[PDB]
């Protein structure tokens, strides 16, 4: 039954994967060599007594990242036909990821995906991890998702993507890749997620009291988020929300692929002894911008949908009271056409935290999946940065030199405008 296939396209996704599978190991009790001392079948498959290995495909054109895995803790976990390497880098270039180089690795990748699919009995869907900045993260993701649609049709495909920060950027042509990729996401993704490194960095600095934030602990937060999302299938609690069920509640109109995944409560392992983290208290926190994982301000938009995935020692009764409280908060504005836009999941499986980070282990947590129209603002910022460079065709020769057509940028940009317009319409 219910099984997942994870695909780690970007190294962001790989490092997230490292955190995720590290977490999954702890949560299911599985060792780095696959040794166990059940529902783990959703993520791991037995390959002989006491040899449970992860149902995932890692795709890199740049073995360095894979080699980190092959020389890291879970080299004894992942096998050689999961850890797929290529030859030439995608040079942060959608054209190379989707075409020039990626076209020569996609065939291998798909064959390994098909293998895992053949090994599945109840494939729920695919968990794709990547960025909107990298070449493979962008272009290859685009290539792959197209191919996945061909192979698996309506089988659910999630895109857990790293969303370019409004200030904390790393590269210069991030807008180029982001715009081209998001077009494909809208075409092929069944539900897409966005993570802002900048937002989390401030969350770490403030809520976790972190003097020096980085990807290690940032990813651990992401793994808590994703674990909470998938907790409903891998663990049997009270209200187990399926991926189809997530779509049912989080999609009122086909194109709405935003749901911001807000994890609460981001408490440091110190103040936790003073934090009275009740169901209501945590809920109050999760509906604030204080814990939002994308830089924005939801109070200037409207909530189309809001799913709250509670986890651990959570009581429906207390949840209902907490929800009613939230419902009276005028700071939370739902769309007029969805008076019932609330979804509750409750999973009896205490939040699990992996040693090697802060994120105090708590008895209660909630992942809010928020479809708020304000996200169009973030999209506008991205589009603007794109326009600034695009107006001068800056760096365009790096894409055109890979055979990229100018219209690919123009058309993708137009689709991105339509995306915002869709968020404008549902706000009415």
């Amino acid at each position: 039954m219910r099984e997942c296939i994870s695909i780690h396209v970007g190294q962001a996704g790989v490092q997230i994967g490292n955190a995720c599978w590290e977490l999954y190991c702890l949560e299911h009790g599985i060792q780095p060599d696959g040794q166990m001392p059940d529902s783990f079948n959703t993520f791991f498959s037995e390959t002989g007594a006491g040899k449970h290995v992860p149902r995932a495909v890692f795709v890199d054109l740049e073995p360095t990242v894979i080699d980190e895995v092959r020389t890291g803790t879970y080299r004894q976990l992942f096998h050689p036909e999961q850890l797929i390497t290529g030859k030439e880098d995608a040079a942060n270039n959608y054209a190379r990821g989707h075409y020039t180089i990626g076209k020569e690795i996609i065939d291998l990748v798909l064959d390994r995906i098909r293998k895992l699919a053949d090994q599945c009995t109840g494939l729920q869907g695919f968990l794709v991890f990547h960025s909107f900045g990298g070449g493979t993260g962008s272009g290859f993701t685009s290539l792959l998702m197209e191919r996945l649609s061909v192979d698996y049709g309506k089988k659910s495909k999630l895109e857990f993507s790293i969303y370019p920060a409004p200030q904390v950027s790393t590269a210069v042509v991030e807008p180029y890749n982001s715009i081209l990729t998001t077009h494909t996401t809208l075409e092929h993704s069944d539900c897409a997620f966005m993570v802002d490194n900048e937002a989390i960095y401030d969350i770490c600095r403030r809520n976790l009291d972190i003097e020096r934030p980085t990807y290690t602990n940032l990813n651990r937060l992401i793994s808590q988020i994703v674990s909470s999302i998938t907790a409903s299938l891998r663990f049997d609690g009270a209200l187990n929300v399926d991926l189809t069920e997530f779509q049912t509640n989080l999609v009122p109109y086909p194109r709405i692929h935003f749901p911001l995944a807000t994890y609460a409560p981001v408490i440091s392992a110190e103040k936790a002894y003073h934090e009275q983290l009740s169901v209501a208290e945590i809920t109050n926190a999760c509906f604030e911008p204080a814990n939002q994982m994308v830089k924005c301000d939801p109070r200037h938009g409207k909530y189309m949908a809001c799913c709250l995935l509670y986890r651990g020692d959570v009581v429906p009764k207390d949840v209902n009271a907490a929800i009613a409280t939230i419902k009276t908060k005028r700071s939370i504005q739902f769309v007029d056409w969805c008076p019932t836009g609330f979804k509750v999941g409750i999973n009896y499986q205490p939040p699990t935290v992996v040693p090697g980070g802060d994120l105090a282990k708590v008895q209660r947590a909630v992942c809010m999946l928020s479809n708020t129209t304000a996200i169009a603002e973030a999209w506008a910022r991205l589009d603007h940065k794109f326009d600034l460079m695009y107006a001068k065709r800056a760096f365009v020769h790096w894409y055109v030199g890979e055979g990229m057509e100018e219209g690919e940028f123009s058309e993708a940009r137009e689709d991105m405008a339509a995306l915002e317009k869709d968020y404008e319409e549902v706000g009415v």
């Binding site: 190294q11 880098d89 040079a91 790393t170 960095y201 600095r205 020096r212 800056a394």
Partner: protein, 426 residues
Amino acid sequence: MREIVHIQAGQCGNQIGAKFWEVISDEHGIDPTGSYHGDSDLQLERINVYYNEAAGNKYVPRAILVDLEPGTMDSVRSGPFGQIFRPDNFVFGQSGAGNNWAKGHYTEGAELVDSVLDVVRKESESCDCLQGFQLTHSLGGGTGSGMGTLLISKIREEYPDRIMNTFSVVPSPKVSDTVVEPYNATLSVHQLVENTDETYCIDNEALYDICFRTLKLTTPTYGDLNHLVSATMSGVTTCLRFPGQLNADLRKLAVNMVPFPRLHFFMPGFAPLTSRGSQQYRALTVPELTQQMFDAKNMMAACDPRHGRYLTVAAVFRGRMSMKEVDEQMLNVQNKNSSYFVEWIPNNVKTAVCDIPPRGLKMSATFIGNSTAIQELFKRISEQFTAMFRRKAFLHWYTGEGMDEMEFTEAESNMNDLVSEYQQYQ
């Protein structure tokens, strides 16, 4: 995979290259016999990029020495590199150009290049996945300029998809070594801008100021100039050789370095530049690194960035660092110095952080600035070129090689157009 073929064109290129290969060998724990005596895995993880592991586990630099003056080979070979560099890599003629670009390009260099390319091809076949070429030389003339130019053109033709990366010593504005620097530089640069993908502007005069004033040294030698240059070269491909917390590597970097094919002449810098005494009053933090890294006084080219505009700055870090710490400094700098950056380029500074610091340092950072201020280099050289060319001074040294005033006129014209392009982007 991702092997790099290094070429040392000319005595300058050979001396700098030797220092470079000293640095790399030191970083990777390789002694002068080729034997590896390190202690990590990462030292060998990408050793293939720069070395061929010969029988006996002897790591031989994938480097070719190109020259027209015998004894130049020995100026390297007589040192540790008598056991490091391969005899087949010492490829040279028996003439010399005498600081004459044409002699080292059209005639004497053209006689040599056949045997150089043969060795190049050997290494090309020896490589499992060639990432590109790396040439070190000078614009002073002769081999480095002429032969360097020739090799770039020939190799580019053979490998149009693997464009050569160039580290070249440019003409100083005050500290001149010869008279016809404007000729040799102008002729070479005319060709370089058409063939190279990225050129590092290395100015001895600026380096002299760094050594003397920033590093508080007495009498800056060539070895001290090369120390700074080789530090840069190591930084440029640190993320190639070693792992970090993210990673856009070499070509992935290149895509974000320039928004145009021609304006690919960068100024290099190195953050941690200080005297041993003054280190005791400094703190090991990225904020200190960035204050030094973005200091125009520590630029290795004699052009003041602030006179122009930044198309982009690459900031390549080495050592365990916080991404927040680094990126916040980046943001603070771009915001505070926003007046020096190009308005319509959202992000004007690129972040890359490798977790492996330089030997002897706890941390460092490499500055690669794409600023239009470099136009001053090209403008001044063109002016000096005009000063001589207008009188046909020394002209006969090149017309004897089959050159004509038209070629010179075109080379000058082209450099002027290059300056104009910088002014336009400024």
